[PDB]
Design a protein around this ligand. Structure first.
Ligand SMILES: CC(C)(COP(=O)(O)OP(=O)(O)OC[C@H]1O[C@@H](n2cnc3c(N)ncnc32)[C@H](O)[C@@H]1OP(=O)(O)O)[C@@H](O)C(=O)NCCC(=O)NCCSCC(=O)c1ccc(O)cc1
Ligand SMILES: CC(C)(COP(=O)(O)OP(=O)(O)OC[C@H]1O[C@@H](n2cnc3c(N)ncnc32)[C@H](O)[C@@H]1OP(=O)(O)O)[C@@H](O)C(=O)NCCC(=O)NCCSCC(=O)c1ccc(O)cc1
Ligand SMILES: CC(C)(COP(=O)(O)OP(=O)(O)OC[C@H]1O[C@@H](n2cnc3c(N)ncnc32)[C@H](O)[C@@H]1OP(=O)(O)O)[C@@H](O)C(=O)NCCC(=O)NCCSCC(=O)c1ccc(O)cc1
Ligand SMILES: CC(C)(COP(=O)(O)OP(=O)(O)OC[C@H]1O[C@@H](n2cnc3c(N)ncnc32)[C@H](O)[C@@H]1OP(=O)(O)O)[C@@H](O)C(=O)NCCC(=O)NCCSCC(=O)c1ccc(O)cc1
Ligand SMILES: [Cl-]
Ligand SMILES: [Cl-]
Ligand SMILES: [Cl-]
Ligand SMILES: [Cl-]
Ligand SMILES: [Cl-]
Ligand SMILES: [Cl-]
Ligand SMILES: [Cl-]
Ligand SMILES: [Cl-]
Lengths: 142, 140, 142, 140
């Protein structure tokens, strides 16, 4: 809703932000438009793996929530549902501390699938990882 | 804690504090060619819509495939890290557990590849992850 | 139809097998069931790149045609259309000569998307490449 | 022929005989960080249903990203080969041309990554390919 600043498209949500994975690791959406969205997270141990680096899953999740929610922002009101269907994240350079900043750019908005390219950077602006997200858009059963 | 491979004397982050320990991932079996892990679904593993977070599946696969590689290569002076993770989602999971099984399909000198299958309590294939693990010589 | 032994689901096809990319490089389907299909191709220069190895695109194409056609075999008659939506091929070992043998195993058959894992092997049975194929199934406009 | 980088005295397969030369791929621009190529749609590039073969897009991207890497690294004693190719299809192409543009996003010591965009004659994004290129020291 606003806990992590996610899009307010519903009156009630099944799980409260603070309690979700997102709330737990502290993902926060910064900008959000139909074609582009941004989010970030402060690196803490909760975001890392045992070796001291940001967990690969963390980048995937950030990209996942971002691209999906960005789709949700537009289609919800149109009676649709949006869920992640494919997430392909590639790791270029590890992140040990600071933040992870994600930028999602929409590259295709089909009737059934939206596609977003997500770039994940470190505090120095280096490209640490990228995620190609494919979002399925379907009519709500609800 | 998570039953991760014990390959070193000290780890920078304690299990309980890692993302793995936070969501509750636990390794069940581990061999050079195959490994398994699972996690109980809690809200910590879900997104606001009540379903298991796509990131959760990615994370499980990533840790499982990477650690299964570390298990073999660590003792050989090598480091193993995730290079690519491609997860595809077939059916959501609302509660119960997520169980992963990683099958090694290629063990190259510089890259290992694992196919990970993620299933629900009914044994249904909910998602798959194709994991590419980079293997490199440890730096001083 | 049978030129490359593709599934006979229509009376007429827009392009004749021998003239398509498939016919050109010589892809031939061997077995074909709803859950699993196989195909092969003899390596010739037409399948290679300038460095003398089987072109990465060749593996992608073989996987692509196979997984799609295998879906087509079942859904066509059901009034659907099937096209490749995502193809992720990973290369483990190059192939210089002989054949490339592909085996597609269906792992998920949703209402809108089917997913097949394709393994591409050399004459010695080695796993040279794999392709994760996502096939979109939609109702024919035709 | 295809305007591929001239980096060596002899090539095992002549351009015209390769898959590239057979379908008609031609490199247009090439720099270390970006390259372009295109091809005229012919039946040789299509599948039986009359659309450009998904494999055609994969192939174009693969050759373009790989050769753009070879262009830089060959002279450095390295070999470049495709390691992973992930192509996603957004809109089919029935005739005309397919134009590709490869943008380098990471140039690591062992892996280079390129984003390839494939467009039709109307400039519409028909498909994308995420190419991972392995860079290794040449073998004797
Ligand atoms: C995959 C998908 C159907 C998904 O639909 P979407 O992402 O939601 O996009 P959307 O529904 O908004 O429509 C996009 C365009 O797709 C096409 N399309 C979508 N639905 C349909 C349909 N039911 N019937 C025909 N065309 C359709 C159409 O061109 C449409 O544009 P428009 O007519 O609406 O202006 C669409 O993105 C698409 O068609 N991508 C192109 C797929 C493609 O060309 N794959 C490669 C060729 S097929 C695989 C292959 O290589 C092969 C080789 C040999 C062989 O024997 C068989 C197959
Ligand atoms: C990518 C990689 C180098 C990664 O190495 P890895 O996963 O750690 O595996 P590993 O290093 O243990 O070696 C596996 C095999 O790869 C080959 N290989 C690995 N490193 C090397 C090297 N430095 N030099 C030569 N061969 C090598 C070799 O065949 C080796 O087998 P072996 O002789 O050691 O028994 C290896 O898996 C591989 O070579 N995969 C095959 C790559 C391939 O064939 N891609 C498609 C063709 S190249 C892309 C293309 O389509 C293209 C098209 C047109 C054009 O103009 C240019 C390019
Ligand atoms: C993607 C897709 C909709 C494609 O449909 P399909 O491949 O053709 O399969 P099919 O239509 O036959 O149905 C499969 C199952 O999907 C579900 N499903 C399909 N269509 C719908 C729909 N319109 N409404 C609800 N559930 C549906 C349902 O569980 C269905 O089973 P059943 O009720 O028919 O027995 C389906 O495969 C699926 O739902 N996969 C699971 C998607 C998923 O769980 N992604 C991860 C969670 S959402 C992304 C995320 O992490 C996130 C995080 C934070 C945040 O704030 C927002 C999002
Ligand atoms: C994959 C690869 C090693 C490939 O190397 P490359 O593409 O050729 O790039 P390059 O070799 O030039 O080096 C780039 C950076 O990678 C790092 N790196 C590369 N090789 C090494 C090495 N042998 N030792 C240490 N760092 C290295 C290093 O940070 C380097 O920067 P620099 O110090 O040289 O300036 C590099 O891109 C990389 O390290 N990517 C980051 C990998 C990553 O962070 N994956 C996610 C975390 S590990 C997977 C995971 O989530 C997990 C979770 C739980 C668990 O229990 C275990 C694992
Ligand atoms: Cl929120
Ligand atoms: Cl767009
Ligand atoms: Cl542990
Ligand atoms: Cl293996
Ligand atoms: Cl045929
Ligand atoms: Cl199945
Ligand atoms: Cl040439
Ligand atoms: Cl770059």
């Amino acid at each position: 809703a606003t806990g992590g600043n996610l899009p307010d498209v519903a009156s009630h949500y099944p799980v409260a932000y603070e309690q979700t994975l997102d709330g737990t690791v502290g993902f926060v959406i910064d900008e959000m438009t139909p074609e582009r969205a941004t989010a970030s997270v402060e690196v803490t141990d909760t975001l890392r793996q045992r070796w001291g680096l940001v967990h690969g899953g963390a980048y995937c999740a950030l990209a996942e929530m971002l691209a999906t929610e960005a789709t949700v922002a537009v289609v919800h009101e149109k009676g649709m549902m949006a869920v992640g269907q494919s997430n392909h994240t590639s790791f270029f350079r590890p992140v040990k501390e600071g933040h992870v900043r994600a930028e999602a750019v929409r590259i295709h908005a089909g009737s059934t699938t939206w596609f977003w390219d997500v770039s994940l950077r470190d505090d120095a602006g280096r490209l640490c990882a990228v995620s190609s997200m494919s979002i399925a858009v379907r009519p709500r059963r609800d």
